[PDB]
Design an enzyme around this catalytic site. Structure first.
Site, PDB file in Angstrom:
ATOM      1  N   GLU A  35      -0.848  41.139  26.344  1.00  0.00           N
ATOM      2  CA  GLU A  35      -1.173  41.335  24.979  1.00  0.00           C
ATOM      3  C   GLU A  35      -0.120  43.072  24.602  1.00  0.00           C
ATOM      4  O   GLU A  35       0.969  42.617  23.940  1.00  0.00           O
ATOM      5  CB  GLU A  35      -2.117  41.617  24.426  1.00  0.00           C
ATOM      6  CG  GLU A  35      -2.650  40.560  24.017  1.00  0.00           C
ATOM      7  CD  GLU A  35      -2.438  39.582  23.075  1.00  0.00           C
ATOM      8  OE1 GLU A  35      -0.938  39.711  22.473  1.00  0.00           O
ATOM      9  OE2 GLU A  35      -2.338  38.287  22.995  1.00  0.00           O
ATOM     10  N   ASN A  46       6.860  40.803  13.565  1.00  0.00           N
ATOM     11  CA  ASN A  46       6.784  39.301  13.192  1.00  0.00           C
ATOM     12  C   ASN A  46       7.682  38.617  11.913  1.00  0.00           C
ATOM     13  O   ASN A  46       7.753  39.897  10.645  1.00  0.00           O
ATOM     14  CB  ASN A  46       5.723  37.969  13.147  1.00  0.00           C
ATOM     15  CG  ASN A  46       4.845  38.350  14.728  1.00  0.00           C
ATOM     16  OD1 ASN A  46       5.061  38.771  15.369  1.00  0.00           O
ATOM     17  ND2 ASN A  46       3.428  39.294  13.806  1.00  0.00           N
ATOM     18  N   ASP A  48       7.463  36.113   9.755  1.00  0.00           N
ATOM     19  CA  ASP A  48       7.304  35.446   8.733  1.00  0.00           C
ATOM     20  C   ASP A  48       5.778  36.703   8.507  1.00  0.00           C
ATOM     21  O   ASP A  48       5.022  35.956   7.337  1.00  0.00           O
ATOM     22  CB  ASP A  48       5.448  35.125   9.216  1.00  0.00           C
ATOM     23  CG  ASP A  48       4.544  35.476  10.118  1.00  0.00           C
ATOM     24  OD1 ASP A  48       4.452  37.127  10.565  1.00  0.00           O
ATOM     25  OD2 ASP A  48       2.694  35.253  10.046  1.00  0.00           O
ATOM     26  N   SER A  50       4.153  39.165   8.988  1.00  0.00           N
ATOM     27  CA  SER A  50       2.964  40.362   9.388  1.00  0.00           C
ATOM     28  C   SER A  50       3.295  40.658  10.659  1.00  0.00           C
ATOM     29  O   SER A  50       5.001  40.667  11.013  1.00  0.00           O
ATOM     30  CB  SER A  50       1.671  38.753   9.536  1.00  0.00           C
ATOM     31  OG  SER A  50       2.443  38.720  11.570  1.00  0.00           O
ATOM     32  N   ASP A  52       1.899  42.508  14.483  1.00  0.00           N
ATOM     33  CA  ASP A  52       0.481  42.007  15.638  1.00  0.00           C
ATOM     34  C   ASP A  52       0.863  43.937  15.929  1.00  0.00           C
ATOM     35  O   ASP A  52       1.629  44.745  16.265  1.00  0.00           O
ATOM     36  CB  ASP A  52       1.080  41.686  17.066  1.00  0.00           C
ATOM     37  CG  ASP A  52       1.243  40.440  16.169  1.00  0.00           C
ATOM     38  OD1 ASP A  52       0.788  39.345  15.748  1.00  0.00           O
ATOM     39  OD2 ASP A  52       1.979  39.191  17.242  1.00  0.00           O
ATOM     40  N   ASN A  59      -3.889  40.366  14.216  1.00  0.00           N
ATOM     41  CA  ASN A  59      -2.937  40.209  13.215  1.00  0.00           C
ATOM     42  C   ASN A  59      -2.680  40.804  12.161  1.00  0.00           C
ATOM     43  O   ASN A  59      -3.838  40.789  12.186  1.00  0.00           O
ATOM     44  CB  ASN A  59      -2.585  38.599  13.653  1.00  0.00           C
ATOM     45  CG  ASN A  59      -0.670  38.354  12.925  1.00  0.00           C
ATOM     46  OD1 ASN A  59      -0.970  37.685  10.778  1.00  0.00           O
ATOM     47  ND2 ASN A  59      -0.071  38.710  13.338  1.00  0.00           N
TER      48      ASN A  59
END
Length: 129
Positions: A35, A46, A48, A50, A52, A59
Site C-alpha cells: 500500500e 484520487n 474522485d 478523496s 488515501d 480512504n
C-alpha cells in the site's frame, strides 16, 4: 517515517494485530508494504475528490475527515492528518475498524492482489518478535 520490515511487524504486534479477526501479522505487514512501502507519510490523491492516507492508505470518503471529500462519513472519527503520524496507532485503530465493520482485509486492494494467496509469513520471518 519509512518503517523497516521487522520494526513495523513489532509495532503492529504490540498493537495486537497478529490474528486480529483471523489475519496473521504477516498479512498486515504485507498490506502496508504494497500500500505505502512502509511510508507513514504516503498520500494518494484520487480524481474522485478523496485521498488515501498513511501506511495503510485509508480512504477519506468513509474512514477519515479531510474536509475536501464528498460523502464524508468519518467512521474512524479522526482527521486524516492523524493517519500521517510517525506512530501507527491511529492507522492501526482505523484499520481495525475497517475490518471490524465486516469488510476483511479484502478492503485493501494491495493486500488482495499482492498478499492474498502468498507466503505472508515471509514478511515477519527472521524478525525479533
Amino acid at each position: 517515517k519509512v518503517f523497516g520490515r521487522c520494526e513495523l511487524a513489532a509495532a503492529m504486534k504490540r498493537h495486537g494485530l497478529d490474528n486480529y479477526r483471523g489475519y496473521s501479522l504477516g498479512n498486515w505487514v504485507c498490506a502496508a508494504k504494497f500500500e505505502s512501502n512502509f511510508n507513514t507519510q504516503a498520500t494518494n490523491r484520487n480524481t474522485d475528490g478523496s485521498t488515501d492516507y498513511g501506511i495503510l492508505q485509508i480512504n477519506s470518503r468513509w474512514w477519515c475527515n479531510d474536509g475536501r471529500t464528498p460523502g464524508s462519513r468519518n467512521l474512524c472519527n479522526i482527521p486524516c492528518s492523524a493517519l500521517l503520524s510517525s506512530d501507527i496507532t491511529a492507522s492501526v485503530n482505523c484499520a481495525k475498524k475497517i475490518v471490524s465493520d465486516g469488510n476483511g482485509m479484502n478492503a485493501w486492494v494491495a493486500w488482495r492482489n499482492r498478499c492474498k494467496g502468498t507466503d505472508v509469513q515471509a514478511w515477519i520471518r527472521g524478525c525479533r518478535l
